[PDB]
């Protein structure tokens, strides 16, 4: 088995906020985690944080999760709720800073959308 991730892909990481312990509040995540913890993650995120939209993507043989929420929340809140679900599998959470870049980026190759909660992915939330 390779290592697993220690961050999200290189071409990522300037959308991201990297300040996960920090008390600011967002309104977009992202999560990288393993292709069967993002199936779970999809469904139960979508109900616990009533998210405006999620979409769900092939990342480099795992997967990662991206969310608006139409409340606040510390990336660390979210993380709390995801790591107790995502058991013994790698588990990356962060905040987005630029949502329609981020988003964009992962419908485009290397990655691919797996599936997502607004048809024709999106294109009046950004």
Same mark, same amino acid.
Do not use: W
């Given at each position: 088995?390779?290592?697993?991730?220690?961050?999200?892909?290189?071409?990522?990481?300037?959308?991201?906020?990297?300040?996960?312990?920090?008390?600011?509040?967002?309104?977009?995540?992202?999560?990288?985690?393993?292709?069967?913890?993002?199936?779970?993650?999809?469904? *139960?995120?979508?109900? *616990?944080?009533?998210?405006?939209?999620?979409?769900?993507?092939?990342?480099?043989?795992?997967?990662?999760?991206?969310?608006?929420?139409?409340?606040?929340?510390?990336?660390?809140?979210?993380?709390?709720?995801?790591?107790?679900?995502?058991? +013994?599998?790698?588990?990356?959470?962060? &905040?987005?800073? *630029?949502?329609?870049?981020?988003?964009?980026?992962?419908?485009?190759?290397? +990655?691919?959308?797996?599936?997502?909660?607004?048809? &024709? &992915?999106?294109?009046?939330? +950004?």
């Amino acid at each position: 088995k390779v290592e697993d991730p220690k961050d999200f892909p290189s071409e990522l990481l300037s959308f991201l906020s990297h300040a996960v312990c920090s008390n600011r509040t967002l309104a977009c995540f992202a999560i990288y985690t393993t292709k069967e913890k993002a199936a779970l993650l999809y469904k *139960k995120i979508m109900e *616990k944080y009533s998210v405006t939209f999620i979409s769900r993507h092939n990342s480099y043989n795992h997967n990662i999760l991206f969310f608006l929420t139409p409340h606040r929340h510390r990336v660390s809140a979210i993380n709390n709720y995801a790591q107790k679900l995502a058991t +013994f599998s790698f588990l990356i959470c962060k &905040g987005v800073n *630029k949502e329609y870049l981020m988003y964009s980026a992962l419908t485009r190759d290397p +990655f691919s959308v797996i599936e997502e909660s607004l048809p &024709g &992915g999106l294109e009046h939330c +950004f």
